[PDB]
Amino acid sequence: VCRDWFKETACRHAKSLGNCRTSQKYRANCAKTCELC
Structure with a gap:
């Protein structure tokens, strides 16, 4: 299953x-x- 991988916020930064x-x-x-x- 896909999903974020670093901290859910590391991701929001890249979003x-x-x-x-x-x-x-x-x-x-x-x-x-x-x-x-």
Whole structure:
């Protein structure tokens, strides 16, 4: 099952910063912050 992976906030950073889908972990590993799940 997909989902974030670092702290649920490490992800929210990448969701409101630019890496939501431009960074790998930050998009998939933090797919809960950008809905990339």
